[PDB]
Design a protein around this ligand. Structure first.
Ligand code: HEM
Length: 152
């Protein structure tokens, strides 16, 4: 699949808004992921003992991990699909080191959309949501291709 230039424009304008508060978006995304899908927290050896939303909000480690993920995602999105070099190492680490199934990447994609809608009323309508859904789908499909090459 491919996104149109117009779809990329929508994605990257949204992402530039995310960049005004990367840490806050990252915290909200991971907390939404862990509350909606608690099994995902087990994959985080650095902070899998966290239990409550208040503990998660007080964790500097959770915040830093969220910032790193959003930073990498932003760098990849800015390649507008031409992201082979940037995405390959990430796909490899998630297959082999972190052991993240595709279903968990679907869960985090849902969390991203949810948080974008929650944090950006009036600036995240149907056009932007559809474009971001497609960009995240492309990201997941390209990761899945690398997973298949590894037999994961
Ligand atoms: C938008 C999707 C995601 C992006 C862009 C992303 C990006 C990253 C990056 C850049 C790193 C550090 C470098 C590396 O190890 O490759 C990382 C680490 C990690 N990721 Fe992801 N990730 C994503 C989704 C996920 C999901 C859904 C999970 C688990 C359910 C996960 C689990 C981990 C873990 C456990 C680490 C190590 C964290 C730590 O150091 O404590 N990632 N991720």
């Amino acid at each position: 699949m491919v996104l149109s230039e117009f779809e990329w424009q929508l994605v990257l304008h949204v992402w530039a808004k995310v960049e005004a508060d990367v840490a806050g978006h990252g915290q909200d995304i991971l907390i939404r992921l862990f509350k909606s899908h608690p099994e995902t927290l087990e994959k985080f050896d650095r902070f899998k003992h966290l239990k409550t939303e208040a503990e998660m909000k007080a964790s500097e480690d959770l915040k830093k991990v969220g910032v790193t993920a959003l930073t990498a995602l932003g760098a990849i999105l800015k390649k507008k699909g031409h992201h082979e070099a940037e995405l390959k190492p990430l796909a490899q680490s998630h297959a082999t080191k972190h052991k993240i199934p595709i279903k968990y990447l679907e869960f985090i994609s849902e969390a991203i959309i949810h948080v974008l809608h929650s944090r950006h009323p009036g600036n995240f309508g149907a056009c932007a949501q559809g474009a971001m859904n497609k960009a995240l789908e492309l990201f997941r499909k390209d990761i899945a291709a690398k997973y298949k090459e590894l037999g994961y």
